[PDB]
Amino acid sequence: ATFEIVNRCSYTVWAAASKGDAALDAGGRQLNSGESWTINVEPGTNGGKIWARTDCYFDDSGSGICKTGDCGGLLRCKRFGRPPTTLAEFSLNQYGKDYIDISNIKGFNVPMDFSPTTRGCRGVRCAADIVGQCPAKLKAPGGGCNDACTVFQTSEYCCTTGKCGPTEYSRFFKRLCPDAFSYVLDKPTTVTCPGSSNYRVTFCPTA
């Protein structure tokens, strides 16, 4: 499956793509304002994620650091990134279908649209200004808006026991971005697509 990843932000981002224990394609790349990077993801990829990293410095060997989304200091990511990170999430070819969603469960850093480029389903979008409206106790000094689990580490926020409900913090994400997961047991906003669909992930989809 192809994913075109497009940076429409006015700033540079470093795109990242991973399934948790391995890179997807090259795993990571700089995208200046306006650039596009097309990657190929193996069919049957389960639990893949794509995200943006901000304010990064890499040396010539591709080691360094990012203020948001850092995946162990590597340009070419092999594992998931450090919150806060808006996430495009997908599982491909799962009994005939593809499954996509956007999640705020690990916070928000960059607005995003995640849309198929082939027929037969809708896209999802989380483009509101969550960073600027963030509640004081969630603001990440390094940039972005943390989820409550990352800040407070309690069973209720992390949904450790499988029994959590909505909270004042998860309701902030849900009010700004109704179409993204705001906590673990949120009412699903996953979109079912035809198996083997192709996709575009756009950072900063709106003006």
Side-chain angles (χ1 to χ4, degrees), residues 90-200:
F90 48 91
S91 291
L92 312 181
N93 307 104
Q94 301 289 311
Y95 300 99
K97 296 293 166 174
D98 287 1
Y99 298 89
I100 76 186
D101 71 64
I102 288 174
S103 175
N104 282 321
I105 289 159
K106 294 286 175 186
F108 182 93
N109 65 342
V110 175
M112 162 196 297
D113 182 277
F114 184 9
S115 283
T117 53
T118 51
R119 78 107 210 143
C121 56
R122 62 163 184 289
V124 290
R125 180 175 295 200
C126 177
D129 184 18
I130 283 163
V131 173
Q133 306 288 5
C134 189
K137 296 191 171 124
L138 304 182
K139 278 159 188 282
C145 194
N146 290 129
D147 53 299
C149 174
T150 302
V151 176
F152 297 104
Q153 292 293 273
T154 71
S155 300
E156 188 60 19
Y157 297 136
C158 302
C159 296
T160 304
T161 72
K163 269 291 164 94
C164 73
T167 70
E168 179 166 306
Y169 294 120
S170 79
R171 285 175 195 100
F172 159 77
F173 294 93
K174 201 49 156 185
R175 176 176 65 81
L176 272 274
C177 282
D179 282 3
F181 280 85
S182 61
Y183 72 105
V184 173
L185 293 185
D186 209 345
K187 179 217 207 180
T189 40
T190 309
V191 177
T192 303
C193 288
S196 286
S197 291
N198 303 313
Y199 304 95
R200 181 176 289 120

Side-chain angles (χ1 to χ4, degrees), residues 45-110:
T45 293
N46 190 53
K49 302 196 192 304
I50 283 159
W51 67 100
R53 302 169 282 169
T54 58
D55 304 298
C56 296
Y57 298 94
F58 294 103
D59 68 18
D60 308 330
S61 68
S63 279
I65 186 154
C66 295
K67 290 211 193 201
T68 67
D70 195 44
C71 57
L74 300 169
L75 170 59
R76 296 191 36 181
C77 291
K78 308 186 236 265
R79 327 287 274 199
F80 296 142
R82 183 174 191 276
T85 48
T86 315
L87 303 163
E89 312 189 304
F90 48 91
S91 291
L92 312 181
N93 307 104
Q94 301 289 311
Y95 300 99
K97 296 293 166 174
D98 287 1
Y99 298 89
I100 76 186
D101 71 64
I102 288 174
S103 175
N104 282 321
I105 289 159
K106 294 286 175 186
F108 182 93
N109 65 342
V110 175

